[PDB]
Amino acid sequence: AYQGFTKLGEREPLNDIILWEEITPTGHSRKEYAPVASTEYRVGEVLKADGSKVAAGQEAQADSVCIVNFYADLQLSYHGQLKVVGIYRDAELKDLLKLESGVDAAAVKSALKAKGIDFVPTG
Amino acid sequence: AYQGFTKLGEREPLNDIILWEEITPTGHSRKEYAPVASTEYRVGEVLKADGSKVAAGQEAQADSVCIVNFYADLQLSYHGQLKVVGIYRDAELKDLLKLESGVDAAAVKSALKAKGIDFVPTG
Amino acid sequence: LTNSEKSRFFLADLTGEVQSIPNTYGYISGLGLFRSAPQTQTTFLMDLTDWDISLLDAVDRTSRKAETSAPERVRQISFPMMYFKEVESITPDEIQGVRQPGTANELTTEAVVRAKKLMKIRTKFDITREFLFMQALKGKVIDANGVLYADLYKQFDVTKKTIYFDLDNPNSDIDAHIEDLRMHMEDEAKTGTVINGEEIHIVVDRTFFSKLIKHPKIRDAYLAQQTPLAWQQITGSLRTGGTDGVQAHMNRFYYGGVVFVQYNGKFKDKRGKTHTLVSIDGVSDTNVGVGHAFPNVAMLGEANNIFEVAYAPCPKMGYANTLGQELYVFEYEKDRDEGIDFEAHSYMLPYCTRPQLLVDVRSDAE
């Protein structure tokens, strides 16, 4: 390119952050959201109750952790699903978290830990 | 999708617009352009001498017909080239021009008519 | 037998003809480093995947707690390629009447002119290829004009490594800098195999070689030796190896497990500015020596080759979507017997898939 380098992009995070979850016939720790407006979800981003990403100052209202890769242009997930699913109940994820700008992790982790979501150290 | 259709766009126009040109060792009818930032080029759009597209009210400033598919954010053409190339001098083209909104065809065609470009009717 | 000077009626002799062919360098081209990779499309992609490892932290037994490891990282990059076109024409009015140099009264034909034009074109393309290969060895592929085509360090997200030998200071540790350069390749290769850092090419310019072979430490070390190598290096020809483009034997020097080769290659462009092959873009202090160290072919093995050159077809009416070629030459005749047209095409890019291994070397101190 005119800038000297062309980077076609990085592979989107894989749905591997889940280490343990309450496995039930209908799914216990997973809830589906309505994709809000033109929003690009990825694996490991913390969502609010309505479905939008947690922003700075809104840490206490951390509702779940996204575990699907959604595309605003297609209005479809990377598995061709109409909804976006997050983890909001008893489960144990990895430290990989796609936080927003200016949002502290500790408040997000404590809010999620209140609901029974645990994070394991990652090397 | 949630709208019931997932159209993935149409193929970009091919470089079949050229029907005849003054074939010459150093490209008699070809002109190089430094691409304007954040600008999509397709085969058929008319460009000014500056390098941007002919907007409404400036049809008399038409200079050349772009024959490359630039990708702006990539800053490379669809053939891996660095600069935008359009035909401006004597040539014969298909009647496939991608004019902008509010841009009349007659003034653009007559402006290119003086340059030496002719448009064969297509059906 | 030709007309004498001063008189059109007496005769003299035309013994012969002397020619001054310009110097051409082909060391990097003749090294065989860049394996040929013919290409069909105009751009080629590449996948970059890597992982990392860390140390376990001790965790108590009764409170059953554990650790986890981060997943891999997969990216992708793309490469554009340079297109070179060169046109030359033959006309009857540069053949008619003109006399063949070195001959008394015989006339130039079309065959000799065509042969010399083709030879000049091929030589020009060869020197351009050598310059491009040297630039790719430098880690940044800059065209002779100066336009950037592929910056390997930003594309692969690596930083350039340069080593200051400090040859001026008599107390400098040449062994320490040599060891640093040797271990850099082993550390930064990251190929997953076992690396031997002694298998590298160190190509330096005249000044760096002169300062290196005249350092008090090196000379005093080699003078107090009774081996044939030391005798040759001190009082003997320092020109083993070679078969350079100009000289029959290149200067090279053995100090550690590595060798230092002096490469004098340089070319000029249309603007007249010279392009020294062994140089650093920016440095020109004249009194500082520069060099370039790159891994040998037999260091990472043939399975992991990092020096490749691509070739893609010319945009002609019947060469589309075919394997690339080193050079295309086309014959086109002017209408009305007005002459002959020549065109030469070459669509290439030399690149390095592990730019971290390309290490720069300087003679001054940081």
Residues of chain A by 3-state class (helix, strand, coil), percent to 5: 10, 30, 60
Half-sphere exposure (CA, 13 Å, Cβ side) for C240? 9
Q: Judge: C80–B82 Cβ closer than 8 Å, yes or no.
A: yes
B25 touches chain C (CB under 8 A): yes
Distance (Å, whole) CA A34 – CA C41: 43
Cα angle C84-C85-C86, degrees, rounded to a multiple of 5: 125
Half-sphere exposure (CA, 13 Å, Cβ side) for C314? 16
Distance (Å, whole) CA A45 – CA A28: 19
- The CA distances from residue C77 to A9, B78, C188, in Å, are 8, 15, 20
**Distance (Å) from the alpha carbon of C175 to chain B's nearest alpha carbon:** 45
Distance (Å, whole) CA C307 – CA C305: 6
CB-based burial, C60-92: b 16+ in 10 Å, e otherwise: eeeeeeeebeeeeeebebbbbbbbbebeeebee
Q: Judge: C151–A5 Cβ closer than 8 Å, yes or no.
A: yes
Half-sphere exposure (CA, 13 Å, Cβ side) for C168? 9
- Of C43, C87, C147, Cβ closest to residue B80: C43
Q: Which residues of C are less than 8 Å from B71 in CB distance? A: none
3 state DSSP class of C230: helix
CB-based burial, C130-150: b 16+ in 10 Å, e otherwise: bbbbbbbbbbbbbebeeebbb
Q: For the range A75-82, what are the long-range contacts, defined as Cβ-Cβ under 8 Å and sequence gap of 24 or more?
A: A75/A35, A75/B1, A75/B2, A75/B3, A76/B1, A76/B2, A76/B6, A78/A12, A82/B1, A82/B2
User: CB-based contacts of A85: which residues, under 8 Å, 6+ apart?
Assistant: A30, A31, A32, A33, A66, A67, A68
Q: Which residues of C are less than 8 Å from A6 in CB distance? A: 77-80, 155
Distance (Å, whole) CA C192 – CA C342: 50
C-beta separation of C100 from C107 below 8 A: yes
- Residue B90: name the closest of B36, B38, B30 by CA: B30
B75 touches chain A (CB under 8 A): yes
* β-bridge mates for residue C266, sequence order: C276
C-beta separation of C212 from C285 below 8 A: no
Residues of chain C by 3-state class (helix, strand, coil), percent to 5: 25, 25, 50
Q: What's the one-letter identity of residue C325? A: Q
Distance (Å, whole) CA C343 – CA C316: 11
C33 touches chain B (CB under 8 A): no
Length of chain C equals 366
- Of A3, A74, A76, Cβ closest to residue B75: A3
**Distance (Å) from the alpha carbon of B74 to chain A's nearest alpha carbon:** 7
Q: Which residues of C are less than 8 Å from B82 in CB distance? A: 80, 147, 149
- Residue B67: name the closest of B26, B117, B113, B7 by CA: B117
Distance (Å, whole) CA A20 – CA C65: 13
A81 touches chain B (CB under 8 A): no
Q: What's the one-letter identity of residue C38? A: P
Q: Which residues of A are less than 8 Å from C281 in CB distance? A: none
Place of tokens 């030589």: C123
Distance (Å, whole) CA B30 – CA A81: 48
- Count of A-B CB contacts under 8 Å: 22
- Residue C200: name the closest of C157, C158, C163, C247 by CA: C163
Place of tokens 């309450």: A22
Phi and psi (nearest 5°) for B113? -60, -40
- The CA distances from residue B20 to B17, B89, B90, B99, B118, in Å, are 9, 11, 9, 21, 9
Place of tokens 């001063």: C6
User: CB-based contacts of C335: which residues, under 8 Å, 6+ apart?
Assistant: none
Name the residue in chain C with its Cα closest to that of B79. C42
Q: How many CB atoms lie within 10 A of CB A38?
A: 8
Resolution, expressed in angstroms to one decimal? 3.2
**Helix C216-223 vs helix C206-213: angle between axes, to the nearest 10 degrees?**
50
Method underlying the structure: cryo-EM
Distance (Å, whole) CA A100 – CA A66: 13
User: CB-based contacts of C180: which residues, under 8 Å, 6+ apart?
Assistant: C163
Cα pseudo-dihedral A87, A93, A98, A100, rounded to 10 = 70
Supply the DSSP symbol for C216: H
